[PDB]
Design a protein around this ligand. Structure first.
Ligand SMILES: CCCCCCCCCCCCCCCCCC(=O)OC[C@H](COP(=O)([O-])OCC(O)COP(=O)([O-])OC[C@@H](COC(=O)CCCCCCCCCCCCCCCCC)OC(=O)CCCCCCCCCCCCCCCCC)OC(=O)CCCCCCCCCCCCCCCCC
Ligand SMILES: CCCCCCCCCCCCCCCCCC(=O)OC[C@H](COP(=O)([O-])OCC(O)COP(=O)([O-])OC[C@@H](COC(=O)CCCCCCCCCCCCCCCCC)OC(=O)CCCCCCCCCCCCCCCCC)OC(=O)CCCCCCCCCCCCCCCCC
Ligand SMILES: CCCCCCCCCCCCCCCCCC(=O)OC[C@H](COP(=O)([O-])OCC(O)COP(=O)([O-])OC[C@@H](COC(=O)CCCCCCCCCCCCCCCCC)OC(=O)CCCCCCCCCCCCCCCCC)OC(=O)CCCCCCCCCCCCCCCCC
Ligand SMILES: CCCCCCCCCCCCCCCCCC(=O)OC[C@H](COP(=O)([O-])OCC(O)COP(=O)([O-])OC[C@@H](COC(=O)CCCCCCCCCCCCCCCCC)OC(=O)CCCCCCCCCCCCCCCCC)OC(=O)CCCCCCCCCCCCCCCCC
Ligand SMILES: CCCCCCCCCCCCCCCCC[C@@H](O)O[C@H](CO[C@H](O)CCCCCCCCCCCCCCC)COP(=O)(O)OCC[N+](C)(C)C
Ligand SMILES: CCCCCCCCCCCCCCCCC[C@@H](O)O[C@H](CO[C@H](O)CCCCCCCCCCCCCCC)COP(=O)(O)OCC[N+](C)(C)C
Ligand SMILES: CCCCCCCCCCCCCCCCC[C@@H](O)O[C@H](CO[C@H](O)CCCCCCCCCCCCCCC)COP(=O)(O)OCC[N+](C)(C)C
Ligand SMILES: CCCCCCCC/C=C\CCCCCCCC(=O)O[C@H](COC(=O)CCCCCCC/C=C/CCCCCCCC)COP(=O)(O)OCCN
Lengths: 56, 459, 64, 175, 32, 63, 329, 121, 102
């Protein structure tokens, strides 16, 4: 029954929501370490005509 | 890494708002789901590491231990489901909370790019374990066991804090990457000798080294089942992981500072293997077996050769899984028998055949049978020690023979022979125990197909 | 139960330090350690001396 | 097969004798080989042809990654962590390449020894010499570095060896 | 369900103590 | 014991059989990329340096 | 092309099918022993062909199909060696096992767990086949431990009998004493010749020193029940008669002599090890024959006869005639 | 460090005027979230001690705890950031004003530096 | 009597009141569903899908890349007569050795 199983099975959504939040936080934290993107002496590459960043 | 840490944290509100009769189901399902997420970390590269951020990084040494840690929790829940039947809802939720906190602390410990954070979580892993041992323990000696486990660890690990802050004051950073790249030789001086001792003793006490192992039989015997498996499987590997991480700055002093510990371990392996032969208890026998295997791991780490490190990692994982299985089987026997004595119940193979099969498989794996990863790690360490000195083979072979002897003694005394007459409450084994044994053993026989996943960074 | 208690948990409270017990403890807990240390130290010293002189023929000893 | 280059894995021309039946007694080996061909090789070949023609209908490529060269640890500053990192990664890659070179030489040695039969002691002298040379070079390069090996330690080992050999050469010349 | 007296005790010099221990272990006094 | 064995076999097969069938289909219809030189002026994606199609899919999707 | 490799792998593969089927329905009927016997007979009649091809041409081959793992400069792969020894010992072992299984179908008709007995026999046969056809020391060690474990499981067939458990543990003890020397040899070979493969070991060791050969001799003495470690073979008769007829008579106990045969290129180069193995063989054959003179249990007498024959082939190895020892096997 | 006697310091100012020259912490700062979590924990403990339904006894009280903790945490973070900025400013000014005590290291390359090699055997 | 205490209760057999007990819980429905989810998420989802995922992990360790590089290096050095592996890891000219003059 809708709106009845929710009051008993709302706890199951907690862990996957936490996983998605963790993935988002990991990407956001990775966004702060772009001080050498496409500046590495080994992977220094000329950008593609329709490319703005080497990686996200 | 936060994709792993965050769900483990969310396990707590999930458990605390669950219904009174559905906590075990939810905890088991979401713990298994978390383990699947942790599998992604295993794909390491031959280069430096998976540097996730400034606080967490993953290597090919941390990946197998992390996967094992995440995998152990569902098994702990299935093991604890038995003796917590008559427990109130709040106390069961507190037990699951302690287990979840232990897993979270271990997960944060194993990456811990900075050494002070590693130490903080390495000591944080001590509170939930002590609470579990001293609260949900059957015997009246659980209090003394908890005191021994706390103080043996803390006395060793307290000088480590001073050593670490001193290193930070002189070197200037405790980040493991900077520590590895800027490492400089340690001159032969009394101050450097004591720095070596401070940095090493904290991890050698937890492994444990022979002569400081008195806390382990007590902690393993008096603890509940889940505490026993988490002690034998993961908590013993903290010392070895820390030692392999920290020996990068102790060279070349180790070249001659390893002699006392090498001799102690190479003789204590024989001593504890012999002790296992004359034992009136099952859990004590398994604990002493764990001491012997960890002494071998200590020898491997102190040798400091690539084959030594590979064998040490393989033996770590294999011994963790095997000891967890053996403790599970002993607990299943104790639940029906209620005595915990090896010779009180005999001939159980006639009454419980499948559990006899599980006993045989666990004993064979403990016996270091090829091509299981137990023997892979064993043989790698044997070859490395042989390269170190040709005379170690005598001690290692003696240990192998005694290990086979006590493993088959454990199997024969409890499984073969005529059943005891005055015991008539040996009910048929449940599906839960069989599933627990299967989930313990199948990963071992699966990992024997892909050894490179557990051979460490020096593969 | 009495046998198990006597074997395991009743050893220390009835223990007294006597010349026989002390001598046996010192011997059986110290002698093997120093014996093995001396043996391994001598072997490794000999090996290192041979290495320094260079007369060991370590060819093909790639893995270590 | 063209899957592997013939020059890196050399193989002798593998000359084989011709059948010279001395007697009229029919040998069972030829009959067994014929029937085995008939009812084993044909179905296997048809299945492989079907699979290959299925593969040909969808073809795509994968490429070998090429790595640029970066300054070694010899031209790296004392505390310049970035150049040290680049040189260390390059040294690790070179270490792996050297290990695979030694593996290739060992494979050639084992193959020659098994192929030559009872005259392996004589007919594979060249392979043993190549393995000896490569093994000595590898042992001089990477042996005794320890579990915590790094580019700095290998460079220090090379410097110590160069000092030893320079002192020996100077002593020999001045004698 | 076992009392403290049943458990093993320290060696006793006195005969009365010896007798008590022999009875505890279910054996004759002069057989102990 | 027989019931436990039956349940374990049933679940293991219930997942493995679709996995084995899918693996066989992918191997027989799409698998085994061949190795070719990098075209001039073209930079491949990070997942184009692997052979098996399942490995390429894993690398593209997750890493 | 060249059906040698195909058939020499197919025999070992077809020996494995009943083990896979052991969880099927046929395991729960009385058709299982006949099924296993027919499978063994078919494997024998299939493996008979590579013997003919070797006899006609002199075919020799090694197959390294699956690459297990690479440790820096060492490579471990699932390698099978199909030389004269392997291609000749496959049919003999399969023939003897077929006869023993057909005999057991009558001897053990009253045993409720007859299907498990046949499954154990097949597992032992598979492990011995792995040991015989092994090409590197690790696979040989796998077979070496597998045959010992199967012997432990089959000696103590009757769990109620205490003497059965005692004999099983005694056999394991002596086999581990031999495994000490086996592991010593393995470690020495890897740390000096940089390979566990037989080819590199043969090539890189022109003058084999004393240590690896002494380790190999200790392992052979342990598993072939020589004078130092003989009693486990006579004590291993607590098991059923078919087990002692197949395992501890003709197939499993010749594993040490077969190991010494396999390393004959290194045995000839050393004179002290040849003398030591000749002396060991002589003393053990005399001792077991003398003991068998006055024995009163028939199985004990035949076990001591087996020990004497094992000592005789060790003597044959000592005088540097390995092929004659293989023929006597 | 002992910045108590630092010249030009107002005796009892929580946040000097110059501290306005620094970026304020974001409202989504992890430390502020931690203060909010501490406030929520205090609310739960308060409910537990009073023997009330722990999760849902007083929503206003829990909200007040969270808000007070967030407020104090925000101001404390501002003061902490200002003090650390002061320490770094003093450090850099002193190292600039005393060039003799902090000489420029003669940059060297690993090629011309002899480090002893200790083999592992 | 030293104190007031409940008698030690006897262990409750899970089979007596419920055959097909699975050893999970005394409530048959919750017990059965616990068994189902444990078997499905342990064996079916993790132990099989995860095993296949680990089996088919992309080669980030660069084993085939190292093999190809070694093949190219060996071919080039054999064709031109170079002595294969080089004794010095780093070229001598770049390195500077402090003079002794002793
Ligand atoms: C880490 C891995 C494993 C390692 C750990 C395990 C091993 C290491 C730790 C354990 C071993 C350490 C023990 C060494 C010292 C401990 C002795 C002790 O605590 O004394 C308590 C204990 C307290 O004395 P007490 O209770 O007043 O007298 C009780 C006796 O009845 C009175 O006895 P008595 O008066 O009749 O005779 C005493 C007398 C006579 O001694 C003898 O009988 C023979 C001489 C033996 C020692 C000299 C050689 O002793 C001497 O005169 C020799 C003095 C030198 O002393 C003894 O009973 C033993 C006395 C003999 C000392 C022998 C110790 C030497 C060991 C080698 C060093
Ligand atoms: C308790 C147990 C717990 C289990 C827990 C879960 C298990 C975890 C394991 C997962 C790992 C999966 C994996 O990685 O797969 C490995 C691997 C995958 O291969 P791959 O790397 O993806 O492909 C590489 C190539 O690029 C691609 O090669 P290709 O494309 O050229 O090959 C063609 C294709 C297709 O090939 C063919 O179909 C044809 C080939 C033969 C044709 C011969 C002729 C037949 C037709 C002719 C006659 C009809 C026409 C004429 C009619 C007229 C007649 C006169 O072959 C395949 O598809 C291979 C099948 C792979 C199936 C693997 C099964 C894994 C299942 C995972 C879950 C396990 C659950 C258990 C139950 C599983 C189900 C039973 O699969 C195998 O290795 C299969 C075994 C092959 C061994 C052959 C036997 C040799 C034995 C030697 C030793 C003997 C001494 C003893
Ligand atoms: C030989 C290869 C065969 C391959 C065929 C495929 C077999 C797949 C099996 C996978 C693992 C089994 C799962 C473990 C629990 C078993 C479940 C159970 O409860 O059984 C009841 C079930 C039904 O019986 P029931 O009447 O209802 O229950 C009554 C009682 O249970 C009464 O029970 P029982 O009296 O019937 O005894 C139970 C039985 C079964 O219980 C076990 O002990 C099985 C575990 C044995 C391993 C012991 C640990 C040592 C480490 C080995 C690790 C290798 C794993 C490789 C990858 C595995 C993938 C999962 O125990 C034994 O028979 C003694 C085993 C000792 C064998 C020693 C030799 C080991 C090394 C041999 C070479 C391996 C590598 C080959 C490399 C070169 C050749 C290519 O019986 C079975 O299912 C028997 C299964 C067949 C036995 C397999 C033993 C050797 C195979 C090991 C892995 C295969 C390697 C791959 C080569 C392929 C070619
Ligand atoms: C990490 C920590 C985090 C939380 C920190 C503290 C906060 C809560 C503690 C207050 C105590 C309340 C309590 O007792 O629990 C009862 C209560 C359930 O029972 P109840 O029917 O309501 O009332 C029963 C009475 O309270 C009392 O029931 P009773 O008296 O009938 O039961 C007797 C029981 C009652 O005694 C207790 O229950 C003790 C209470 C715990 C102690 C509090 C310590 C303070 C914090 C220190 C934590 C240390 C962490 C460091 C690691 C070292 C570990 C020691 O006492 C015993 O069993 C005697 C022996 C005790 C065993 C050993 C004691 C060890 C205590 C150490 C605890 C450490 C971990 C705590 C984790 C949270 C536990 C609630 O639990 C809760 O409902 C609250 C749990 C959390 C609620 C989360 C809901 C929000 C989630 C939904 C939104 C999703 C969030 C994400 C947003 C984004 C998504 C998109
Ligand atoms: C025939 C096929 C055979 C092989 C099948 C293999 C299937 C493997 C399935 C198991 C996967 C194991 C889990 C892997 C988790 C690690 C990777 C994960 O963290 O990645 C996340 C992504 O995860 C996925 O989005 C979700 C996968 C979770 C579910 C896996 C499938 C099985 C789930 C089963 C759950 C229960 C099913 C229902 C039961 C009732 C975040 O990725 P992100 O860091 O952004 O990537 C950046 C790089 N980009 C930009 C190129 C992407
Ligand atoms: C009990 C269970 C196990 C616990 C842990 C056991 C491990 C702890 C053992 C400590 C390891 C070695 C300590 C010192 C090693 C240095 C080598 C030294 O001992 O040998 C001689 C040193 O001579 C003497 O040993 C001086 C020290 C004597 C005093 C130390 C106490 C010795 C016995 C105490 C044992 C107690 C151990 C347990 C304490 C609770 C060499 O003389 P020298 O070449 O000139 O000096 C070398 C050092 N230099 C180069 C820096 C100058
Ligand atoms: C009941 C009676 C028997 C019935 C069963 C009959 C069937 C027999 C089959 C049983 C064994 C037969 C052997 C067959 C092996 C073939 C499969 C093998 O080759 O694949 C392995 C692959 O298997 C996996 O690598 C091993 C499993 C991964 C281990 C993870 C465990 C699962 C997670 C659970 C938690 C772990 C806890 C411990 C943490 C460390 C080896 O991989 P590899 O040869 O290279 O190449 C794979 C393909 N490539 C080329 C594309 C790369
Ligand atoms: C299970 C129980 C185990 C107990 C373990 C306890 C022993 C651990 C080893 C000693 C711990 C203390 C070491 C100090 C921490 C390291 C700090 C350091 O390295 O700094 C040194 C300082 O070194 C010291 O101060 C050491 C003093 C030790 C005092 C405390 C003694 C504790 C017991 C000593 C013997 C124990 C050794 C064996 C223990 C075996 C386990 C029982 C450098 O001094 P500087 O000031 O920088 O001088 C430079 C200018 N020349």
């Amino acid at each position: 029954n809708v709106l009845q199983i929710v009051r008993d099975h709302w706890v199951h959504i907690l862990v996957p929501v936490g996983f998605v939040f963790g993935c988002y936080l990991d990407r956001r934290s990775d966004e702060k370490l772009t001080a050498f993107r496409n500046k590495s002496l080994l992977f220094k590459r000329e950008l593609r005509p329709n490319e703005e960043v080497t990686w996200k | 890494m936060l994709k792993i840490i965050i769900p483990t944290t969310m396990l707590l509100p999930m458990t605390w708002m669950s219904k009174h009769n559905m906590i075990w189901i939810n905890a088991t399902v979401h713990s298994l789901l978390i383990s699947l997420i942790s599998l992604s970390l295993l794909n390491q590269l031959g280069e430096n590491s998976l540097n996730f951020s400034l606080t967490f990084f993953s290597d090919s040494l941390s990946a197998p231990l992390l996967v094992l840690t995440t995998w152990l929790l569902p098994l702990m829940l299935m093991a604890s489901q038995s003796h917590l039947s008559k427990e109130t809802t709040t106390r069961k939720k507190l037990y699951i909370t302690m287990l979840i906190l232990l897993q979270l602390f271990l997960i944060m410990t194993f990456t811990a790019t900075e050494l002070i954070l590693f130490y903080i979580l390495f000591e944080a892993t001590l509170v939930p374990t002590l609470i579990i041992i001293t609260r949900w323990g059957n015997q009246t000696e659980r209090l003394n066991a908890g005191l021994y486990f706390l103080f043996y660890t803390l006395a060793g690990s307290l000088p480590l804090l001073v050593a670490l802050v001193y290193i930070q004051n002189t070197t200037g950073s405790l980040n493991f990457l900077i520590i590895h790249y800027w490492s400089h030789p340690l001159s032969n001086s009394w101050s450097n000798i004591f720095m070596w001792l401070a940095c090493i003793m904290a991890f050698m006490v937890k492994m444990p080294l022979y002569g400081l192992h008195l806390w382990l039989p007590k902690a393993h015997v008096e603890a509940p089942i889940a505490g026993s498996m988490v002690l034998a499987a993961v908590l013993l590997k903290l010392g070895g992981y820390g030692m392999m991480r920290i020996t990068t700055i102790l060279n070349p002093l180790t070249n001659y500072m390893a002699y006392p510990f090498l001799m102690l371990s190479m003789w204590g392996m024989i001593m504890t293997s012999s002790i296992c032969l004359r034992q009136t208890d099952l859990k004590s026998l398994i604990a002493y077996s764990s001491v012997s295997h960890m002494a071998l791991v200590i020898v491997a780490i102190m040798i400091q050769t690539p084959w030594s490190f590979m064998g040490a990692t393989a033996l770590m994982i294999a011994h963790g899984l095997t000891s967890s299985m053996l403790f599970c089987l002993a607990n299943t026997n104790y639940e029906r028998v209620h005595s915990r004595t090896m010779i009180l119940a005999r001939g159980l193979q006639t009454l419980l055949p499948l559990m006899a099969t599980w006993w045989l498989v666990a004993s064979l794996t403990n016996l270091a049978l090829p091509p299981s990863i137990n023997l892979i790690g064993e043989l790698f360490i044997i070859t490395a020690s042989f390269s170190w000195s040709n005379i170690t083979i005598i001690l290692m072979g003696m240990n192998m023979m005694i290990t086979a002897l006590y493993s088959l003694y454990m199997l024969i005394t409890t499984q073969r022979g005529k059943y005891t007459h005055h015991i008539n409450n040996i009910k048929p084994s449940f599906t839960r125990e069989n599933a627990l044994m299967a989930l313990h053993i199948l990963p071992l026989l699966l990992l024997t197909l892909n050894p490179k996943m557990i051979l460490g960074p020096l593969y | 139960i009495r046998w198990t208690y006597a074997r395991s948990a009743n050893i220390y409270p009835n223990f007294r330090p006597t010349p026989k017990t002390s001598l046996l403890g010192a011997l059986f807990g110290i002698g093997p350690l120093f014996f093995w240390y001396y043996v391994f130290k001598t072997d490794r010293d000999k090996k290192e001396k041979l290495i320094q002189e260079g007369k060991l023929d370590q060819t093909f000893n790639i893995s270590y | 097969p063209d899957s592997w280059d013939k020059d890196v894995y050399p193989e002798p021309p593998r000359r084989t004798p011709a059948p010279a039946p001395q007697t009229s007694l029919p040998n069972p080996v030829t009959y067994l080989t014929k029937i085995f061909d008939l009812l084993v090789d044909r179905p296997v070949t048809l299945a492989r042809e079907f699979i290959e023609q299925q593969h040909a209908k969808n073809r795509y490529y994968y490429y070998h990654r090429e790595f640029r060269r970066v300054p070694d640890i010899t031209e790296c500053e004392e505390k310049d962590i970035l150049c040290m990192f680049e040189a260390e990664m390059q040294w690790r890659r070179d270490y792996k390449v050297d290990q695979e070179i030694v593996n290739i030489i060992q494979e050639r040695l084992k193959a020659c020894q098994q192929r030559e039969g009872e005259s392996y002691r004589q007919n594979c002298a060249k392979e043993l010499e190549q393995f000896t040379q490569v093994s000595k070079a590898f042992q001089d390069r990477y042996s005794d570095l320890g579990a915590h090996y790094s580019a700095r330690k290998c460079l220090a080992k090379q410097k110590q060896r160069m000092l030893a050999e320079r002192k020996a050469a100077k002593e020999a010349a001045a004698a | 369900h076992v009392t403290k007296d049943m458990f093993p005790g320290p060696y006793p010099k006195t005969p009365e103590e010896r007798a008590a221990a022999a009875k505890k272990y279910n054996m004759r006094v002069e057989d102990y | 014991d027989r019931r436990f064995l039956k349940l374990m076999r049933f679940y293991i097969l219930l997942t493995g059989i679709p996995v084995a069938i899918g693996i066989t289909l992918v191997n027989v219809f799409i698998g085994e990329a061949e190795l070719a030189d990098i075209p001039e002026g073209y930079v491949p994606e990070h997942w184009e340096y692997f052979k098996h199609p399942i490995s390429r899919w894993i690398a593209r999707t997750f890493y | 092309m060249n059906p040698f490799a195909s058939l020499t792998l197919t025999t070992l593969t077809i020996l494995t099918i009943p083990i896979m089927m052991s969880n099927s329905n046929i395991y729960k009927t009385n058709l299982y022993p006949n099924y296993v016997k027919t499978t063994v007979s078919y494997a024998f009649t299939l493996s008979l062909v590579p013997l003919l091809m070797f006899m006609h041409t002199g075919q020799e081959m090694i197959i390294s199909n699956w690459h297990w793992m690479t440790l820096q400069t060492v490579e471990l792969s699932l390698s099978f060696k199909m030389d004269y020894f392997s291609v000749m010992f496959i049919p003999v072992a399969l023939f003897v096992t077929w006869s023993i299984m057909e005999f057991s179908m009558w001897y053990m008709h009253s045993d409720p767990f007859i299907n498990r007995f046949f499954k154990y026999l097949l597992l032992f046969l598979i492990t011995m086949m792995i040991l015989v056809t092994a090409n590197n020391l690790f696979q040989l060690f796998i077979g070496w431990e597998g045959v010992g474990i199967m012997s432990f499981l089959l000696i103590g067939w009757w769990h109620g009998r205490t003497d059965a458990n005692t004999a099983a543990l005694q056999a394991i003890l002596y086999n581990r004493i031999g495994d000490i020397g086996f592991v010593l040899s393995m470690a020495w070979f890897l740390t000096h010749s940089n390979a566990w493969d037989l080819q590199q070991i043969f090539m890189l060791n022109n003058e084999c020193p004393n240590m690896p050969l002494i380790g190999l001799l200790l392992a052979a003495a342990g598993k072939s029940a020589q004078f130092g470690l003989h009693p486990w073979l006579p004590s291993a008769m607590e098991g059923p008669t078919p087990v002692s007829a197949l395992l501890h008579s003709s197939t499993m106990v010749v594993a040490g002599v077969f190991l010494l045969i396999r390393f004959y290129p290194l045995m000839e180069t050393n004179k002290l090890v040849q003398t030591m193995t000749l002396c060991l063989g002589a003393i053990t054959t005399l001792f077991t024959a003398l003991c068998a003179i006055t024995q009163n249990d028939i199985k004990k007498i035949v076990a001591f006869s087996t020990s004497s024959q094992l000592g005789l082939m060790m003597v044959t190895i000592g005088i540097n005639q390995p092929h004659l020892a293989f023929l006597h096997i | 460090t002992m910045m108590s006697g630092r010249p030009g310091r107002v005796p009892l100012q929580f946040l000097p005027n110059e501290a306005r020259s620094l970026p304020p912490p974001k409202l989504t700062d992890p430390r502020l979230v931690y203060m909010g979590f501490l406030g929520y924990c205090s609310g739960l403990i308060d409910n537990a001690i009073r023997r009330r339904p722990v999760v849902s006894a007083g929503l206003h009280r829990q909200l007040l705890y969270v808000t007070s903790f967030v407020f104090f945490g925000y101001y404390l973070l501002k003061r902490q950031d200002y003090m650390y900025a002061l320490r770094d400013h003093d450090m850099f000014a002193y190292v600039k004003s005393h060039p003799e005590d902090f000489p420029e290291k003669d940059k060297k390359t690993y090629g011309e530096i002899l480090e002893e090699f200790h083999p592992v055997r | 009597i030293r104190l007031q205490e409940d008698p030690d209760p006897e262990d409750e057999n899970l089979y007596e009141k419920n055959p097909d007990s699975h050893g999970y819980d005394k409530d048959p429905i919750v017990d059965l569903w616990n068994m189902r989810v444990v078997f499905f998420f342990g064996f079916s989802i993790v132990l099989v899908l995860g095993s296949t995922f680990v089996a088919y992990l992309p080669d980030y360790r660069m084993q085939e890349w190292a093999r190809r590089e070694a093949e190219r290096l060996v071919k080039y050095r054999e064709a031109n007569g170079l002595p294969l592996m080089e004794s010095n890891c780093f070229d001598p000219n770049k390195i500077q050795l402090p003079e002794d003059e002793d």
